Automatic annotation (TrEMBL), chains A, B, C, D:
Positions annotated to bind Mn(2+): 194, 218, 222
Matching SMART domains: Iso_dh (SM01329)
Necessary cofactors: Mg(2+)
PANTHER family (alphabetical): DECARBOXYLATING DEHYDROGENASES-ISOCITRATE, ISOPROPYLMALATE, TARTRATE, ISOCITRATE DEHYDROGENASE [NAD] SUBUNIT ALPHA, MITOCHONDRIAL
Naturally occurring in which organism (per UniProt): Thermococcus kodakarensis (strain ATCC BAA-918 / JCM 12380 / KOD1)
UniProt family annotation: Belongs to the isocitrate and isopropylmalate dehydrogenases family.
GO MF annotations in UniProt: 3-isopropylmalate dehydrogenase activity; isocitrate dehydrogenase (NAD+) activity; magnesium ion binding; NAD binding
Protein name (database record): Homoisocitrate dehydrogenase
Keywords: Magnesium, Metal-binding, NAD, Oxidoreductase
GO BP of this protein: isocitrate metabolic process; L-leucine biosynthetic process
Key word Oxidoreductase present: yes
């Protein structure tokens, strides 16, 4: 049995996570789930967004499935639940996928999470400001090895996007990426971000595993969303040494919570990434989504008038149908 | 008389600049032109891409019209002609325009030229790399005042795009921009580059004067070109204290030089920026271009089979036609 | 029983440490000693200057008494034994004492050990070099609290020596020292190093606990030795959280090893610091040294022709004599 | 005729400068003097410590003789007169001499003046502070060439004192000093400041031309004064491209102004440096001072009860006596 920690969060988080968990249960009985509370209410009651004993159980889980959390502008002493989990679980890498639901093409963008690669300081001393940024071989290797394993797993290659023409840290990172990839027999292409943005708009689907330090990579990960009809479809993973946390890119959207119209696709595809991470059949979820959207009604963020449940049921129906066609969907 | 220094350059530079100069002569007799050589051939013969006595005459001119220059990968001692001119003439600001030729809408992107705003160092000391970047109030004010005057002139506003969330230099620059704009009664909007990229793809034409330090602004200035059918239409200006140099964004394209198919629109619209800069009727050039492209055949980079001359003549024809319609195109 | 780990080292280290241990045994039976090997010979046989199992026993000891170690110019893979121990035991503070043996006056100089306070990088990128240095509140507080406890223990005060006029890190450190001292009711004087050097030459004995970051403090700790007849008298301590290592400032002096002329005073006074650290009667050692030097013959580094043993015996004789005078040397 | 600009300053400045000028007039008629006002009174009357028209005349002079200036703790808008002159005249190098008046031995210490070599920033962003320091080849060469010419002129060598073991800027500077010296056939010794301080106390007179960046070199230049009976004897020069300003190290000492007890030796020896700088007979001044102090009464800062005038007259008497002994003091 794999043990998955479930952290629904706030607002639409619980709604979409219910859909994702129901989908996972429809594909495999090899996972069981334990649920945990986190957010402002937990902070009020214990001084931290998540309880220390819940964190300990989470650390020992095989994967985490996370919904979304509402973080107030200024609640003294409070720190974002997702930022806490990334820090406490050592989740140094973030992998975002923009899927083309019609075809199964994707844009894969790997960056470090906050403080996962660079450090240093910024300050004013009026009349002048300074920023210093430092990167090490050890930090560069760690994220390079991750992206390299991800490319290997996909039968793919790396597109390393950067500003090595201006920033020596980027030149350094590029060299390390090329070294690590070379060891593993994985092709590396590289590009200056400025011109690469044109390619990401015009030819998005053919860049393999995009890797960029987050100063530039977070630009790419947002720019790539122009190819999604809604942010509500977009999944992501947060990866560390021996554990990963999967979450939709969308937020807690408190203003539509309880309206039954949250897009569950992002959370459901995040579950598909979770299954892949555990060596299970994430592809069945993707094929089921693609099947559903051919003629299936979608939620209002995608221009349809489905309820969340209509989409969750319709996806589960596709999964069922595939699982029943023993000749068409064979094991492994 | 205004005195304009003309520096045709190499490859297609002379071809497109001939078109631009012919266009300028069609709108005004208040400018006369002096021509200057520059590039590799001048370097071979005198050790610098441009002669020191030619530079002196150029410094005293009212504006510079520049074509394009071929810069070899490694010619020991050689330094790019356009980089030399930016440096020697103190051209600290670059303003790029992506025009919508059907309508007259535009995307205006202001960044500093190389070393126009930030300084500091980058280095490796293996196992670690560092970058330090420094900005001052004086440098920030200078480019802010430029963008603010540009917004005032356009009856517009500034969209300041940045990474102030990560880089203190950007926070500092933002504050200075807001101060200078506030003094001049010019509205400032600001945006983090990551999300702004989505707006620049989806709603490009309604951002006023975009200002961004070049580390991010050069991303924007390339990304904005997705809205141009060809780079060959795109003009730019390089501005300093008391002189400016106008040039197409396109390069010297030596492989099509002499084929009579270079797009002259970028150079011609750069001439239109030059006329605006001198207080002359640049708008007549723009209206003439827009008129020509309604039904006019375009060069092969825009999917037509016109020669450069067909487009140059057709534009001049429009200018003539407008200048003859005394009721439709009145003075000032 | 207190448990002291003894690491004699090389050259004269074993010779002087024998004297120190014999002295400690003459004052107290409340300490027992365990001996450990370390240096090049241990490296040859196990790839590290000290065995990992010996380190583990050392970590659990109450104090460490260290002689001196010979570190070759370049022995690939080798790292100094004393540098290893400082690192592995987290010994962030170094306290050097220059004693006036005639009187019992002292110069006390506290600095951080390597990387105990500042970090950052230095690099060339030819034509330019850069150094970046970073200090944090947490690191500044830690060494400040140490020096403050040391001043309290001595019934003294802190002289904080710096270059706050030039380096912001020093200004920052000074402010933290003043805050911590203020909390504990300990007086802080401060001085720019440049002028302070004159006072340290002319009036050395009246500065209390001198505290300076090592960039300047290591200058002071060497300059202060002009008041010692020989480096061979000078003790020191290396302090961490819950353990400390005491060692003479002198080195392994392999060229006089076996000649029976090494000055044992530095090691013996380092033992006296060790006893103070454990709450035992270090003062008895100091009084015994002072008594011996009144008329006692000293080793050749101090202009006498005593052997090491003559001095060790003569000191132990003084200790014995004091311990026998129950009216003159009373408990506590 | 050489033209020397005289800037007496405040307090004891006028008193000691009168002595120096009288001494110069006693050795040569090849100099004439023009006097200029500067300080707080000039600031009150014109918004700058020195008048712009006086600065212009000063720039064209062959040398400057400067007394001392009183700089208030906080007079809004005011900037130190000597700091202004160093800046405005481009006086990048400072050479301090500690003389042994009994013998004619000296300690020569060369450092850059403020911002003469290093730049960069220091800042807090609370919880952390940073300092960045940058040096260039061009700045390093400039001061290296100065110290190298000074060593050549003295028939001497350079002792380069530094912290190259910790600071890469120092390592860089050391390499440049070694290169420049090597070209000119001048020996370079180098030393880490920490240990060098011991040598400067114990063996001060045998280090040739000491060169150190001011972060460390200003330590040395103060520490070296332990070998002077009073700061009042110590001269200095401030050197730039084509002009130099000579001044005593002592200050304006307003509390003894008008008491007739200011030591004129520092100013007089600064005049001797001025004459050397112009190719004139500074040595005659030094020999005359040394002669006077053999049995001559000195001012109260040196433990005598002479008035300033007694010392000025006694020195001039020695100069006269030497100039009359045509066999003992021959030309050149
Ligand atoms: Na999210
Ligand atoms: Na161009
Ligand atoms: Na030692
Ligand atoms: Na002075």
């Amino acid at each position: 049995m794999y043990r998955v920690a479930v952290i629904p969060g706030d607002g639409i988080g619980p709604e979409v996570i219910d859909g994702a968990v129901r989908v996972l249960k429809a594909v495999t009985g090899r996972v069981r789930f334990e649920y945990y509370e986190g957010g402002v209410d937990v902070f009020q009651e214990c001084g931290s967004p998540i309880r220390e004993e819940d964190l300990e159980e989470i650390r020992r889980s095989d994967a985490v499935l996370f919904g979304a959390t509402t973080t107030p502008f200024d609640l003294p002493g409070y720190r974002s639940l997702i930022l806490t989990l990334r820090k406490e679980l050592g989740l140094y890498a973030n992998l975002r996928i923009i899927p083309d639901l019609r075809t199964g093409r994707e844009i894969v963008i790997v960056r470090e999470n906050s403080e996962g690669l660079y450090f240093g300081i910024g300050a004013v001393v009026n009349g002048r400001a300074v920023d210093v940024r430092l990167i090490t071989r050890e930090g560069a290797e760690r994220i390079a090895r991750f992206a390299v394993e991800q490319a290997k797993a996909r039968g793919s290659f790396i597109t390393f996007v950067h500003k090595a023409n201006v920033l020596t840290g980027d030149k350094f990172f590029r060299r390390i990426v090329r070294e690590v990839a070379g060891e593993e027999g994985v092709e590396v292409r590289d590009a200056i971000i400025d011109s690469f943005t044109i390619k990401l708009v015009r030819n998005p689907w053919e860049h393999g595993v995009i890797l960029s330090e987050n100063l530039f990579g977070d630009i790419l990960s947002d720019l790539a969303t122009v190819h999604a009809g809604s942010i509500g479809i977009v999944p992501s993973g947060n990866y560390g040494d021996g554990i990963a946390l999967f979450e939709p890119v969308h937020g807690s959207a408190p203003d539509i919570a309880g309206k039954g119209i949250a897009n569950p696709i992002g959370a459901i595809l995040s579950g598909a990434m979770l299954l892949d991470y555990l060596g299970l059949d994430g592809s069945l979820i993707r094929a089921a989504v693609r099947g559903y959207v051919v003629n299936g009604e979608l939620t209002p963020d995608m221009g349809g008038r489905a309820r969340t449940e209509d989409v969750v049921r319709g996806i589960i129906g596709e999964i069922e149908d595939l699982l029943s066609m023993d000749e068409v969907w064979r094991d492994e």
